[PDB]
Symmetry: C3
Subunit: 282 residues, 3 copies
């Protein structure tokens, strides 16, 4: 398989956005978890439904449609994705990552990715925020990769490196900012592992994932980071630990979508101010 989008498809979509808004963002943010309300803090906001933008993959999100919002957050011009695409919905990785390449063509230089994740690291608690220090790409091991197919030289190289995907300087800025917020809990940092989903893991699967060294497990983000790094975007991301995974055979209960939603709801306040504060440091 190969990318179903020609370079021209990306630029056509980009040219369309440019001619419909005066906003010219430098930062792009893909919202997840309780970051959904972040759009409410933008100034001079302009919203575009995914369905009205040519070439954009059609979709929505939990309880709300997918919208692309342009605006100024804490003095920084940015564009946000309110709702993303997941392979478990049927989308191939080249559709999932379509927005990342368009952002590049709009002049965006920094990408901020966020998600909800199940905690594998025993020291994590629900509500914890983990800076993504590194990732493990399981679908990648099998060849499921957004870069599979002929390489588009206009975006990047054939064999991009990933060992430096998560910007070091940004992670440092994140720690300083967290300190200034006076938070009692420590800002976590670790390895995110991605799998396909949509079902939740079994005890045995969680144990091996942890033994493989992963700290948090999720069903997104990685394809986006790959493509973003391929085209030279500075990347920074974090996971909202929405639940602790059942690692014990004596299952007291089980992971449920409801609980991850509640967590996203309860941490929204601090997630938003955290991202807002970081804008100034980018």
């Amino acid at each position: 398989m190969q990318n179903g989008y020609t370079y021209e498809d990306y630029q056509d979509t980009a040219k369309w956005l440019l001619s419909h808004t005066e906003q010219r963002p430098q930062v792009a943010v893909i919202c997840g978890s309780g970051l959904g309300g972040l759009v409410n803090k933008l100034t001079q906001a302009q919203t575009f439904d995914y369905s009205e933008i040519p070439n954009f993959p059609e979709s929505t999100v939990p309880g709300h449609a997918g919208r692309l919002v342009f605006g100024i957050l804490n003095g920084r011009a940015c564009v946000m994705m309110q709702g993303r695409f997941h392979m478990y919905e049927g989308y191939p990785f080249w559709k999932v990552t379509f927005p990342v390449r368009v952002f590049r063509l709009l002049g965006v230089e920094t990408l901020v990715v966020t998600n909800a994740a199940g905690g594998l690291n025993p020291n994590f608690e629900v509500g914890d925020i983990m800076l993504i220090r590194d990732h493990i790409n399981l679908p990648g091991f099998s060849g499921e990769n957004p870069l599979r197919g002929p390489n588009e030289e206009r975006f990047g190289v054939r064999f991009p490196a990933m060992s430096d995907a998560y910007d070091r300087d940004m992670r440092q800025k994140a720690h300083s900012t967290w300190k200034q917020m006076g938070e009692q809990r420590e800002l976590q940092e670790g390895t995110y592992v991605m799998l396909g989903g949509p079902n939740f893991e079994t005890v045995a699967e969680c144990r091996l994932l942890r033994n493989l060294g992963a700290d948090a497990v999720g069903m997104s983000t990685v394809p986006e980071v790959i493509v973003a790094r391929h085209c030279g975007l500075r990347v920074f991301g974090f996971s909202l630990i929405t639940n602790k995974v059942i690692m014990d055979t004596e299952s007291q209960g089980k992971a449920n979508h409801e609980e991850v939603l509640e967590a996203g709801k309860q941490a929204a306040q601090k997630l938003e101010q955290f991202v807002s504060l970081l804008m100034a440091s980018i």
Copy 2:
């Protein structure tokens, strides 16, 4: 990719079966290993070749065609799949699992899955029967999942839990029943790991599989359990350890399909009476 079957496809097939037999099963059994002869113990049996049932995936099995047999086993009304589908034959998971959803629509409430597996756990011996306590889904890690694509709300939820896939109470019943059979060998219990096949594993692959915590390795069953749990079927399954995997570089010999067949032949007698006895406890 998404499921190529609409909800209506499943119900059409179900309505067809209902109008062609007076049997109304509560239990569904997918036979593997030496359980192939189990059909011979059914009362008021009615057989349907897979090729005469609308929408059913076409196929067969080792030395025999695939047939759907309805009948009463030890006082319990059930339907059995004599031969299953495997991804290594070319079938996508949505074809492999087609029967599971039809069983649901027929009124079936319990699913019994059996298979042949290579023993990874050093304490296992050829002929051993292992109750599946948990599973590791390698194809799932890459996105190869029977639930990939839009979710059919009429079957279940978008994010189903799998940590409780193998019924606890049923596994307890299995141990009691095994005791009543006066078997000298202990009833094993463990983690089953699934991979695609059709080739047999290498020494290095077997060592990592064991390190990942798996007790037995096979090329089926997991997709069926996923779909079954998604639609609310109580699941119980076991593996017939047909051979011990070569974990030593000094390969004395090598896994062969012939030997797994012999094992299936020699254990048939006890596999059948075991499943027969369990019917009363469901």
Copy 3:
């Protein structure tokens, strides 16, 4: 999915080659790394561009097109693939492995595979040559396998064993030959792990790969060995360690395609004489 080539497709291509050259090779070699110049040591060489051979997958290689070269190397009649196909370019495994089955139909009995790999084993140094003793097939775990689909009985069996894929006797011959070359460095030997690519691994991915027991990591070769063993070809292969993988978070630098190329350039001299010497021992 299934193989898109019928048995007849393979034999048509084979018959075409036979009627266009008087060469009748017993050995087939798939060149990688610095082995690209090996064609320059052939006698009575005859070259065929991949694009002029019916049914052959279209492609090329780094800095040069793909060519099939027939010739005599150190007294042995062989055919060489100057450039191979990779799944990361978009090719399904049944296209990648097409040449292996044609070689079989030409009368070839031995296959020599070579590649460039990143060193995971701490004792390896750039320039090291590692005899492939065993492999780990990650894409295989998910079902991505060149044998997926209906089995062609005219090539081999439905469930081929892989625990003896790398010929024992050949590896012994390789050690003796290396000794006769007076090389100061020891001939390495180990497990090769394959992943899809095209991006290079992250620190976390490299650590788990090493923990899984792999010594070298690459993006090819395994599909070819599978198919070759399926049709009864004696297989022998080795990896040129082109770089040491970044296993440390304090990334001093990062894997780059340039460096792997330099390594391939600097070791070419000994790679060629090594393969040349081995011809006599086959």
